[PDB]
């Protein structure tokens, strides 16, 4: 998208594999605020937002908290307390045409700065002077958007860059976007400290003799003690016999 009409993708109810992003050698900018990139697979959020647009390389520095400039002031504004990641890469191969690509625009004129995450798509003729414009261009009456001139011969700072801004939102609602939380192999007939789906304990896991229902996960003895569990991956029921102990 053009930065003035930046696109927002709302991400919900899915497992996020951030290893695809920080293990990629194709990004020139990868700055995160209020969060560590490698430590992102262990966090759940209520919503994740992915905002994307194209700007100049000169202007990627404005996609950050506390910045000013035409992009931060009038096109895309991040809050001071931003919690997320700003990702960018050079796209001169895609977004520059030989005669000059003009499909990408930015807002040049606006009476006041954008609020954080505000999106202004107005095309109203801007009144730079005393006389009203009445929607007609002319002196002191300017179309508010300007075109980027993306040509391959531009210096790096003037070449197009694609930007993705990830915002991480933690509300008092169910968290629907988490990270992988992989597992390992299981061993039987040996004392292990185990952590199944929501429960944790210590004991020996053995092949069972019970017939759990298709929806039952955790067993329970008469005295409210965990007795058997359903392995999340293999559809096998494991009896939990606490590891041997006794007085000496």
């Amino acid at each position, epitope marked *: 998208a053009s930065v003035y009409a930046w696109n927002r993708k709302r991400i919900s109810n899915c497992v996020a594999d951030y290893s695809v992003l920080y293990n990629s050698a194709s990004f020139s900018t990868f700055k995160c605020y209020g969060v560590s990139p490698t430590k992102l697979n262990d966090l759940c959020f209520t919503n994740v937002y992915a905002d994307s647009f194209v700007i100049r390389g*000169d202007e990627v520095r404005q996609i950050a908290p506390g910045q*000013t*400039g*035409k992009i931060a*002031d*009038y096109n895309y504004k991040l809050p001071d307390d931003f919690t997320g990641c700003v990702i960018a890469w050079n796209s001169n191969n895609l977004d520059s045409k030989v005669g*000059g690509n003009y499909n990408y625009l930015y807002r*040049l*004129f*606006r*009476k*006041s*700065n954008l609020k954080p995450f505000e999106r202004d798509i107005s095309t109203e003729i*801007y*009144q*730079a*002077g*005393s006389t009203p414009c009445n929607g007609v261009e002319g*002196f*002191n009456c*300017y179309f508010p958007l*300007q075109s980027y*001139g*993306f*040509q391959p*011969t*531009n*210096g790096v700072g*003037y070449q197009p860059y694609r930007v993705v801004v990830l915002s991480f939102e933690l509300l008092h609602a169910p968290a629907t976007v988490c990270g992988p939380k992989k597992s390992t192999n299981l061993v039987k007939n040996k004392c292990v400290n185990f952590n199944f789906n929501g429960l944790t304990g210590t004991g020996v896991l053995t092949e069972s003799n019970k017939k759990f229902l298709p929806f039952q996960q955790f067993g329970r003895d008469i005295a409210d003690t965990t007795d058997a569990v359903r392995d999340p991956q293999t559809l096998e029921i494991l009896d939990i016999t606490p590891c041997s102990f006794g007085g000496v």
Partner: antibody, heavy 117, light 108 residues
Framework: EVQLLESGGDLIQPGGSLRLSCAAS????????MSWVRQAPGKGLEWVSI???????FYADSVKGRFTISRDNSKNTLYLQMHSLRAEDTAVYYC???????????WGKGTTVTVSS | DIVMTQSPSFLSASVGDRVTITCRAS??????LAWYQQKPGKAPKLLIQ???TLQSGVPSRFSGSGSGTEFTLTISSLQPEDFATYYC?????????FGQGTKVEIKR
């Protein structure tokens, strides 16, 4: 008609302070990119400072930390407050309206600043 | 950063001549270039913006063109009021860089 009328230039010692004013007519200062540009005796043009319509301000490296650009909406007037003046600040100072990309179409007649011991 | 080299510093022409002033950027600036005219004791006057858009009211003589790294101002038919100094300016830049200027003088 459309005119920018600047004033306040004077002879001043190094380390002194001076405020330049730029009263506008035909253009609304608060709605425009407004800049100060200077020209030392016998030299070329040097951009000094700019204030965006939204209020953001930016400065050339040669004046950063010493000059401040501001404006008064009720007076439709642009200002340049200069502190810690140096001999190399000696110039004619113009205020100009910036059409957005740096192309300035409305200029004042300029006011002359001389900094010397 | 991007350095604007304007050539020549001085050029002599006659009334009615076709004049070509060159402004070279140290790397590609698309069409982000403006041209100014300044006469002694007067404020600069904007002639062309965006490398090829003659400002309203400027006579048809002044022609601007060029793209990428080499830009030119062309005065198709020099008139007596065109002997002056001309400046290029990089547009859409954090630095607002100007060229050194070209003084067009009376040939004899």
């Amino acid at each position: 008609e459309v005119q920018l009328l600047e004033s306040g230039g004077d002879l001043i010692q190094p380390g002194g302070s001076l405020r330049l004013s730029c009263a506008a007519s035909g253009v609304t200062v608060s709605s425009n990119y407004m800049s100060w540009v200077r020209q030392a005796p016998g030299k070329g043009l040097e951009w000094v400072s700019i204030i965006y319509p939204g209020g953001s301000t930016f400065y050339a490296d040669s004046v950063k930390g010493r000059f401040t650009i501001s404006r008064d909406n009720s007076k439709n007037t642009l200002y340049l407050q200069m502190h810690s003046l140096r001999a190399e600040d000696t110039a004619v100072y113009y205020c100009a309206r910036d059409l957005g990309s740096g192309d300035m179409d409305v200029w004042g007649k300029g006011t002359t600043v001389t900094v010397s011991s | 950063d991007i350095v604007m080299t304007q050539s020549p510093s001085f050029l002599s022409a006659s009334v009615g001549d076709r004049v070509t002033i060159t402004c070279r950027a140290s790397q590609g600036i698309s069409s982000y270039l403006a041209w100014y005219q300044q006469k002694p004791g007067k404020a600069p006057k904007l002639l062309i913006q965006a490398a090829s858009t003659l400002q309203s009211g400027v006579p048809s003589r002044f022609s601007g063109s060029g793209s990428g790294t080499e830009f030119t101002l062309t005065i198709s038919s020099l008139q007596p009021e065109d002997f002056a100094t001309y400046y290029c300016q990089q547009l859409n830049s954090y630095r607002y860089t100007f060229g050194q200027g070209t003084k067009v003088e009376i040939k004899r």
